[PDB]
Design a protein around this ligand. Structure first.
Ligand code: NI
Length: 341
């Protein structure tokens, strides 16, 4: 049974609700982005209308096999009518294809559903500038003041400088970057660009990247591993055993691995500056964990919400415990008393 925070009142609409069978009353199923917790349930046997971005629709067709007749892609930043209701899709600054959805209800209420997002001041100059929002369905992944991490640009600067220095010292070093979903592609693309290399990967990951409308992608990636000195591997292989086993497969071309694990937040964030990050090392293998986030920090979240001034907030993440729900409600009331709405 579908929970309340995935339903849009006054409509036949649901958001990120594919794991509950046929939802009674649902005439259109929205999908915010192609991450497994959100698409859980979709397959080639789905027969209801799915609304999404172009990039998410390319992934639904090629990777899950959903038939074409049930995929409804919408352009971004454009007023669209769906089943008699005006909607807009906005860039969520999450992974490729990720959107927020503005719903203009027949009774005059306006609802923003963030999906998953990383709030940014540039959102204050989108179509959200133009009118009031009554209800906010909010990605609360990092809604606590301990969740701190740097800008994506600082993190990429660290990764590029780390890789360029290691390979310039040792032209026989290989760089490896872990992945388990779409998102975070700037990590491996920026490193391969500084090294003058294409990125090598499996056929399955190449297929996924070919769905993402990245300009000039054919110049950036390949399935020919031997030609490449930046390789992608599944995240589960990013450990000393997995990486040893990978170096054997390269036929004595390389004598050192430098590997990156993009994570979300980790408690090493509470003490260490990005500058000061050190790897885990065994022998000719070193592994860096780098805090590249595609969700809002506490501070970015609070600024967005204090600017938007919603009448009501419904969290979509951390909703399963009384303590998490209570904690989030306290911060929403602080923010409202501080800013005066
Ligand atoms: Ni996500």
């Amino acid at each position: 049974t579908c929970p309340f925070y995935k339903k849009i009142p006054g409509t036949g609409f649901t958001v990120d609700a594919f794991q509950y069978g046929v939802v009674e009353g649902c005439t259109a199923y929205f999908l915010t982005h192609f991450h497994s917790d959100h698409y859980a349930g979709l397959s080639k046997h789905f027969t209801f209308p799915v609304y999404c971005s172009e990039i998410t629709g390319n992934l639904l067709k090629n990777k899950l096999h959903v038939q074409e007749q049930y995929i409804h892609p919408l352009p971004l930043d454009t007023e669209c009518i769906v089943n008699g209701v005006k909607v807009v899709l906005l860039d969520a600054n999450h992974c490729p294809g990720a959107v927020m959805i503005l719903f203009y209800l027949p009774n005059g209420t306006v609802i923003l559903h963030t999906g998953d997002f990383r709030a940014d001041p540039s959102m204050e100059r989108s179509l959200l500038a133009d009118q009031k929002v009554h209800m906010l369905y909010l990605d609360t992944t990092y809604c606590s003041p301990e969740y701190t991490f740097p800008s994506q640009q600082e993190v990429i600067r660290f990764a590029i400088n780390t890789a360029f220095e290691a390979v310039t010292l040792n032209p026989h070093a290989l760089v490896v970057c872990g992945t388990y979903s779409i998102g975070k592609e700037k990590v491996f693309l920026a490193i391969a660009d500084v090294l003058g290399s294409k990125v090598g990967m499996s056929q399955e990951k190449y297929k996924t990247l070919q769905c993402l409308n990245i300009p000039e992608i054919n110049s950036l990636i390949t399935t020919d591993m031997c030609s490449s000195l930046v390789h992608l591997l599944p995240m589960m292989q990013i450990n000393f055993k997995g990486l040893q086993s990978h170096l054997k497969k390269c036929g004595g071309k390389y004598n050192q691995i430098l590997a990156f694990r993009p994570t979300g937040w980790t408690h090493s964030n509470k003490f260490t500056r990005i500058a000061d990050v050190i790897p885990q090392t065994k022998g000719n293998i070193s592994i860096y964990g780098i805090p590249y986030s595609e969700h809002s920090s506490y501070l970015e979240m609070k600024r967005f919400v204090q600017w938007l001034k919603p009448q009501k907030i419904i969290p979509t993440v951390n909703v399963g415990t009384w303590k998490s729900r209570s904690t989030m409600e306290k911060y929403f009331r602080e923010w409202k008393l501080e800013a005066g709405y």
